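Can you give me the bound-state structure? Components:
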Amino acid sequence: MRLLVGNDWSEELAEPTGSTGWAVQRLVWFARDGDVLVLPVAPQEEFLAYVTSLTGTRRSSLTVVVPPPGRLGAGALTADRLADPRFLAALREAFAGRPVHEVFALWPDAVVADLADALGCPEALEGHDFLTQSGGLIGSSKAAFRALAAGAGVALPAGAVCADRRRAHRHVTRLLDEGSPVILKQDYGSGSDGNEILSRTPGLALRGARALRVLADSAALDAYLDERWDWLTEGGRHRVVVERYHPGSRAYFAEFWISDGGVRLGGHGEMRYRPLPDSQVMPAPDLDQAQLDDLVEGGRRLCVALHALGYRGVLSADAVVTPAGEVLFTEHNGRATGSTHIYEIVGKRVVGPGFGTDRILLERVWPEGWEAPSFAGALTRLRDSGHLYDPETRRGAVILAAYNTHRKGVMLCYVAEDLEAALHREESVSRLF
Amino acid sequence: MRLLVGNDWSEELAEPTGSTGWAVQRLVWFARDGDVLVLPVAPQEEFLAYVTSLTGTRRSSLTVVVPPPGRLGAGALTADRLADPRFLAALREAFAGRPVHEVFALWPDAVVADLADALGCPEALEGHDFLTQSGGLIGSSKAAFRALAAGAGVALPAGAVCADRRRAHRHVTRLLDEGSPVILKQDYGSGSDGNEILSRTPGLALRGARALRVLADSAALDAYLDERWDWLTEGGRHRVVVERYHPGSRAYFAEFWISDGGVRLGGHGEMRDSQVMPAPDLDQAQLDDLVEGGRRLCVALHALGYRGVLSADAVVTPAGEVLFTEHNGRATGSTHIYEIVGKRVVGPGFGTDRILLERVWPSFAGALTRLRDSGHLYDPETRRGAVILAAYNTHRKGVMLCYVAEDLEAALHREESVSRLF
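Here's the bound-state model for the whole set.
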């Protein structure tokens, strides 16, 4: 039995006040026979039956443990929920005298170490001591990324890490005067929401950032920084990354598993910003050999550094391929990502050895306008139309996520021989939702 | 020709408005033939002459370049001074066509990489790329120390790193309820002034901290945290380290040189007002724990890209236990003492034959005269006596001396004798 923890973005970084308990149910993909899963919201049995039917895991061997709601409700595993004696009593009965062989958590946070210590199994949590000192936050710091990548000789867009407007102004101006647009990034931002593009020229597509600011001269930049610095620094708390922006780049990732033993490549893929990152394909398409070697080697060098300083868990290294074809790394993501369960479980375990050879994976966030009444309702239509993923042909749509009430959808992963065939499948499926 | 940069505490972390230009004159100890030194204030000639006569460095081979004063005056090498075209022109004249072989800086700051880039010699600066991304700041982060130490299996007092009062309250309570006092540390604090001790009982020795706060219970802690948090976090900017405090502990350091090629032991010592090197009264297993613990930590810092000097500080508890408390990525008050005065001036006998004791005098030229006339001045022939380390120290308000003797007892006799001179 392993202890699987479906926790969210660190409580130390932000209040998870918007969480609904949906995203983390991806935890079930990782479950194997006998595991105990901690989730903020109990999954519907139909989702459990479906995922386990594909992974080959015996549903009846799993236990799901859900804490009582906490100070922020039930949407996320807050620290007070994981410390609740009612929850702890339920977790120990779930164990039923079994030792915890391994602790796996979606996010590398001190709360997970708190839990392991309360259960008297800190040895089952790799990187336990590191996490007690909140070292896992390094996995979500772009400032830390810039220094580690630079230190490791990993290719990086030109730039710097700024704690004050005076240095920020100097570095933005240096880059703008070279004819380049610039992207500013919150140290601990999540996704494009934490970034803004600054340009001397109008009309750039907003890929990887929430806004474009067109700044004519030094005085325009003065005005921008005076206006936006509080937001950029999250109220003066954190630094701001300044780096060169490369319009029209494609975005890629190589994700690794970092354990006491070392660094292991999990998978690679492309995140498609069209202009929002609403789909991904794995493995990485349209890279030539040198570029794929650089993406993986770069990511590996970064992880070897993170390993050496004590980080343990999943690590996604994000990069761009510029229009000129250069691979440049833009950040790392220390957590089980939106990609992790897709290549590691759906790809390698469900589809099999042909994933990466015979088949590709295409994930799409449930499209605008698509509608299904329920999980079972989505499964039925896919079943009946013949478009549901089929273990015998290794083709079709895999249901990745639980039913999302607020979106009235699930999430699908199309398995196919190539991108064209997966996009075709998807459009057939569009006639159902 | 090496470029030696006498820079101060990172301008990214604090404004060095207080600096007077005295402390970084220790750069002169590191000078070797043909070097070029960047200092905020020109050293007095007699000082320069004295130091180089001891190190064997030819004085007239050296060039000292002082930038014009900057926005904060002439006390420190602020970024505006180092970027001044007048300074950079004079710097290139100092080189007179010589390539920069190595860049050595007192503090691993991005302004050093700025300088290297502007002079076209980034390859002379080890860790240049790391430094452009301000990676050097990690050498002065206690939050980073805690995570690194923990992850490296380096012995650590119990504690945590807290970004908010709620977690700080929990962790302080845990330790206090165990009957231990607690120390809170500013992440980027420089020295004891960035720490405060919390305790159930008053009267504790204020070793390594600014003040002691007596707290009776959870309500008193609420009130303390609500009132000091702004100070503790530097206005909400940084996290706060919480750890168990050990009263009556002795404090030690082991300092390493971290280069592309790896980690080299510089030296070790005890901080007593005074410091002594090598570290005394440690039994061999405690010294091994001190050095191999510091070394494990530097291996991690090396792997992540840090390059320069790294001093690991530790305490030895009542029970004889070596616990590391922080790291310091910079040329410290100790570095030139063991590395130059010890290994270069005194020689191979240092560490076997001789020890070094640093303390303030019990003007430079006057000190030289009396020491020379009395015969207490350090004598290369005997490898005994007082070395004048610095023309002046501002927080001790006098000339700084390093007594070279067979052992501590003999160093203390020499100092007492120097004391009765006047």
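A couple of observations. Chain A has 13 helices and 17 strands. Residues 177 and 200 of chain A are 9 Å apart (CA to CA).
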